Design a protein around this nucleic acid. Structure first.
Lengths: 110, 313, 111, 122, 110, 110
RNA sequence: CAUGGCUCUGCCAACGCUACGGCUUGGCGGGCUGGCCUUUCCUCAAUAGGUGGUCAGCCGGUUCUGUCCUGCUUCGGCGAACACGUUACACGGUUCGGCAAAACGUCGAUUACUGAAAAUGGAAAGGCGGGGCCGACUU
RNA sequence: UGCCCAUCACCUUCUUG
RNA sequence: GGCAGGCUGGG
């Protein structure tokens, strides 16, 4: 869309530094987290153009994956990369883009 | 080993064994629904089998499943070497380092070493469908002594009926045991020092073809009243007809294959499989399982069950 | 429930396997990257399934769990540094089985 | 005990994968030997080799014929990779014994995929 | 038509690819993902042109938007400065040119 | 038409040696070129298991994307331009596969 | 290979890009992916065993196939269906002794014994085997 | 059955870099 | 196991 992406940019802007703090060791987890984070923007964007609701739920799945990545980086990534606070702040930002995605889902399935 | 063997369910359910059992069960059966459904989560499957067996909650599914053949293989990895050690040298069936070949050689040899003159060659009845499964478990029980291996053996083969299920690794070892009785009524009693049993057939070279005929009568009377196997394909031939033991008629001079029957059956089965006629094959199989219940065709029956996964019953 | 439960049970798989999958030498680094993408990305398969309550997406969740078990099998034979030692595949397979159970129940609940 | 069930137990996927696991078990050693160079070819080969399992399994679990054909497409691509790793890869990668070996294994997986495609097609 | 968009996008790549190779290793996933968005958007234009569904032209637009995102993202990605704001501007001009052509093409199909 | 793959496999046989050559520096471009080159086989293969015109156009796009890669790899600078010959002497090979793809597209279309 | 890694440094350069810091990228070191990343080699080659098909030597090879078939008897036999002398008719050591102590087996024995109970203790003596042993000669 | 070829597990030294 | 049909030779 446009507003979802601008709100998701804030998620990336928060999480990319967190994602770039993930140590070498967890570099593939990092690469994979960054590909989820920076590449969900693609998921949002592609829905923005092609409005078929199929494309909008994939954006939600990616955020849920992004939410998973927060969980993962906070704890499972063994030097729990994302601190719980960072998870908390990130989840707030993801939640904001979650809200907009939800509203957008709802606008489409009227 | 000092007799007793009073803690085999510890070794049967060792991972180290329930894996050997796993690798042995999957050997060749790696294209079967059972292996493939087991293999999925297979050391989690083996962890819930290990801990079914280690609890005494193993309950054989009906006639086998993969786990069932795995439980059998995990028994018969710890049970087998404590029976297959009490199996006189001259029993040549389903043991290790003493296969078919070694018997067609023992027999030949024991007809050369002590050249002999005459010989008996019996061939018990439907050994497996005739095994007391009851005086079998008076031999699977003078050696197990571990009252949990014993209860796993008795799931894997119930202590009733009259029919060791043909083609079970358990049967094999067991019938080479509920047969070893006759080996230990040939070699122990009867002081027959020259013989060879490959499950049912007990070649018994002699020298007084009248003595072998005695030996045979004594063997049949024993194996019929103690063991419930009714010998019939018996002969007391001079060593000259050739001892049709283990597919090779082994007279002192060379030993030529017998087959034709096996091969015919092997082919018949194979054809039936790749004809989509795997239901008339059960009829044929039942038939040939009668013609061969007399003969020592167990390893052969296991072999055919391993090749085509065909429960003849 | 359902998606939340499955993912929390699958998180245990990830928590077990991610360390294993980070240990896979770089040599086995495609295998590793692909294992990690299967492991951490099955979470996406679960996530998608709960977003949809479409039995196909939970069979795709099953497919991913199946692929993950492939991965366990694979990294165990992975010629050298066999990522998942026999023990690690027992442990992992148990965890994936637990996630497998929940996926199965969920597939059934939808059926 | 009853072995841990997957859902949509599909024999063909289980068999195909197990058999294909033999392709991987053959080829992965000889993917991982393609030198440092031809690392991208290797990574792409390995993603084709190790990633065909997902095609089968996604094929196995989601019984939609679309995915089997795409697992056939993947098996076909894997055959290319053998062709490729044998011929076009330049140090060696795969000796022609190995393509001969690998092609047999992929052929076995090809057979099972074909049977599976057919049984679904009916 | 695909040929025009791609030739104009080749200017983005010829501008952005050098810049996207300068995106620091520290931002290497972002870099590699930007490069894959940049070259790779060529594929999304080509696929849009080597056929017609208008859904593949929207995917071309989504890719440009991901590419525009990548410009905005990499500009002010962190301390390892990846893309200068000017480059996002210069690149944004080139992406805008391919954006215009994509828009006209979407319209001509619609 | 599976002479397509066997005529494309000489594009690969020509381009792979020099795509290998594309230095680490241009590694995404290479990885992406190699994924375009060696992955068009998959595009062709999928086309020939389907004979649906959509997959045949995707094969064309990948040859089209492959054509892009040649032109891109041309102005990749430094010693490591796919030298103009090779672009030319691979554009010939890709053109041969292009011809066969075109005939195949036509055979299916009519 | 312990993968054209490194979000990885030092150095030095310069495609380039700079927010003028750098970065990038290339050298160029070094560190780094498990002992010390030897081992574990993944290759391949290669020794000895199994499984099927075949040469008892230029007509067979090789399975796919279609079929066919597993007795008889005169009681001595015969047959087992051209791997055809069903056996390159000669041995693998199926060899020869010497043994059989031990270990092994088995039985004695899940007995004695211990202990309320053999209870997932527990023998032995002995007896019986050869499966075991020692030479010779060959393998 | 001995001469060997399919073929299956091995036993390696071989270096697969 | 054998007969036949293939298939692969024969000089």
């Amino acid at each position: 869309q446009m507003l979802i992406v601008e709100r998701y940019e804030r998620v990336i802007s928060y999480l990319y530094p967190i994602a770039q703090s993930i140590p070498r060791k967890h570099g593939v987890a990092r690469e994979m987290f960054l590909k989820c984070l920076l590449g969900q923007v693609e998921l949002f964007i592609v829905a923005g153009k092609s409005n078929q609701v199929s494309k909008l739920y994939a954006a939600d799945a990616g955020l849920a994956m992004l939410r998973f990545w927060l969980r993962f980086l906070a704890g499972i990534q063994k030097p729990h990369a994302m601190t719980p606070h960072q998870v908390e702040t990130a989840q707030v930002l993801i939640a904001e883009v979650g809200r907009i995605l939800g509203s957008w889902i709802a606008r489409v399935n009227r | 080993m000092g007799k007793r063997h009073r803690n085999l369910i510890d070794q049967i359910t060792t991972w180290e064994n329930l894996l050997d059992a796993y690798r042995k069960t999957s050997h060749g059966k790696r294209r079967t629904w059972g292996y493939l459904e087991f293999k999925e989560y297979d050391l989690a499957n083996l962890l819930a089998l290990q801990a079914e067996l280690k609890a005494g909650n193993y309950e054989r599914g009906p006639y086998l499943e993969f786990k069932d053949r795995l439980v059998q293989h995990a028994l018969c990895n710890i049970v087998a070497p404590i029976f297959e050690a009490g199996l006189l040298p001259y029993t040549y069936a389903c043991r290790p380092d003493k296969g078919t070949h070694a018997g067609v050689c023992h027999v030949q040899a024991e007809l050369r070493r002590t050249r002999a003159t005459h010989f008996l060659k019996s061939d018990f009845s439907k050994f497996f469908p005739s095994i007391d499964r009851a005086a079998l478990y008076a031999m699977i029980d003078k050696k197990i002594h571990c009252a949990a291996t014993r209860r796993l053996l008795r799931v894997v083969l119930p202590d009733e009926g009259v029919g060791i299920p043909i083609g079970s690794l358990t049967s094999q070892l067991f019938a080479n045991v509920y047969g070893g009785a006759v080996d230990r009524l040939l070699h122990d009693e009867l002081k027959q020092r020259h013989w060879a049993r490959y499950m049912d057939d007990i070649v018994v070279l002699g020298d007084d073809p009248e003595e072998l005929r005695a030996v045979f009568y004594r063997l049949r009377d024993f194996a019929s009243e103690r063991l419930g196997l009714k010998i019939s394909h018996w002969q007391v031939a001079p060593v000259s007809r050739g001892i049709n033991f283990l597919g090779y008629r082994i007279w002192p001079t060379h030993k030529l294959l017998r087959k034709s029957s096996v091969k015919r059956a092997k082919r018949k089965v194979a054809n039936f499989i790749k004809h989509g006629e795997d239901e008339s094959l059960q009829r044929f199989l039942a038939s040939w399982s009668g013609h061969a219940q007399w003969a020592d065709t167990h390893n052969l029956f296991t072999w055919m069950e391993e090749q085509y996964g065909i429960a003849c019953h």
